[PDB]
Design a protein around this ligand. Structure first.
Ligand SMILES: Nc1ncnc2c1ncn2[C@@H]1O[C@H](COP(=O)(O)OP(=O)(O)O)[C@@H](O)[C@H]1O
Ligand SMILES: CC(=O)c1cccc(C(SCCN)(c2ccccc2)c2ccccc2)c1
Ligand SMILES: [Cl-]
Ligand SMILES: [Cl-]
Ligand SMILES: [Cl-]
Ligand SMILES: [Cl-]
Ligand SMILES: [Mg+2]
Length: 322
């Protein structure tokens, strides 16, 4: 049963200057979000949904990590496969949630930065857990991106981002695919990390000057494979999806895969897109998923917010087999 959580961000300045009202209420204890749908017309209308965890505008980066990821990180160290993806409207915080930011000036080190998000926190903590256990581990990471249904490789040594990968069926495996051409960097220890992400960032920046609406329109899959010793392999995909408001084929297919999965029909159209193929095992496969849905408090965003909470809620019905 894929775990589904909801995080809502603080108003931004733009919103504040617009005198925006909040339409969203977060009750952690009841694990409920409930939205105020009636406007000036009906003041009592509300839509209310129940999720596995709920995180409010107040919620800090460390709280998301603590609640969502450690339980997750603990089953990859046990040799099981774990996806976490971020779903929602452009502007609502899925990048801030999977990656995070760096606090102005210095004031902090990437390892301790408050605005640090999941990927930095997970990577960083995969050694302090495995190093302190004094066992054998090798961790490697890869980061690709889907745009207009073409795969690009942000970690590749090639100096040019626009060189495209290709995908074929794993010669031995049913639900997996192989990405032909995809660089996988070995990460030897904590101090190699920032360096890699900083390079991924730079290539990502170039990608944005090259392609239209690259940030909002593109999917990003950061994978982390861990090797342990009989040997055990843990593997964690951290997926930051394109905006849900939205060439978009991978997003459609994603909907249709879910929708087919919960209505239980015979052919789930995984194949009909790139993302659903890379991610096939994460939807009704043997991977243990989570979906952090991402929403905004403002009244302006109401229609989109329900749309998210609706979509995210159905997903609670999808059943895996780890
Ligand atoms: N939980 C949060 N706390 C503080 N600021 C946030 C939060 N979520 C988003 N923001 C800010 O809102 C803006 C949009 O965030 P971003 O992650 O780029 O959205 P998305 O990636 O889903 O479009 C950024 O300025 C980001 O810093
Ligand atoms: C792929 C990528 O760019 C990335 C992935 C995870 C974290 C980070 C950043 S945040 C990227 C923009 N959202 C970062 C690294 C290097 C320079 C600037 C930022 C990161 C921030 C804080 C702690 C570690 C890493 C970046
Ligand atoms: Cl709240
Ligand atoms: Cl911190
Ligand atoms: Cl094939
Ligand atoms: Cl339902
Ligand atoms: Mg984003």
């Amino acid at each position: 049963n894929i775990q589904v959580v909801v995080r809502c961000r603080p108003f931004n300045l733009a919103e504040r200057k617009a005198s925006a009202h909040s339409i969203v209420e977060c009750d952690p204890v009841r694990k409920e979000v409930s939205v105020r749908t009636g406007g000036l017309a009906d003041k009592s209308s509300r839509k209310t949904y129940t999720f596995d965890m709920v995180f409010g505008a107040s919620t800090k980066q460390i709280d998301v990590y603590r609640s969502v990821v450690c339980p997750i990180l603990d089953e990859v160290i046990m040799g099981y496969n774990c996806t976490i993806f971020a779903y929602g409207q452009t502007g609502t915080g899925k990048t801030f949630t999977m990656e995070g930011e760096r606090s102005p000036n210095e004031e902090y080190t990437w390892e301790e930065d408050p605005l640090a998000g999941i990927i930095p926190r997970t990577l960083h903590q995969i050694f302090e857990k495995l190093t302190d256990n004094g066992t054998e581990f090798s961790v490697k990471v890869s980061l690709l991106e889907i745009y207009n249904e073409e795969l690009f490789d942000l970690l590749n040594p090639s100096s040019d981002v626009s060189e495209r990968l290709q995908m074929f069926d794993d010669p031995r495996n049913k639900r997996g695919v192989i990405i032909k051409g995809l660089e996988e960097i070995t990460v030897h220890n904590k101090d190699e990390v920032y360096q890699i992400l900083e390079k991924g960032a730079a290539k990502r920046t170039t990608a944005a000057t090259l392609m239209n609406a690259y940030s909002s329109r593109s999917h990003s899959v950061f994978s982390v494979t861990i090797h342990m010793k009989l040997v055990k392999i843990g593997k964690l995909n951290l997926v930051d999806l394109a905006g849900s408001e939205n060439i978009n084929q991978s997003l459609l297919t994603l909907g249709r895969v879910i929708t087919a999965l919960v209505e239980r029909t015979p052919h789930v159209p995984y194949r009909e897109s790139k993302l659903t193929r890379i991610l096939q095992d994460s939807l009704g496969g043997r991977t243990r998923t989570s979906i952090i849905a991402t929403i905004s408090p403002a009244s302006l965003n109401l229609e989109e917010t329900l749309s998210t909470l609706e979509y995210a809620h159905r997903a609670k019905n999808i059943l895996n087999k780890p």
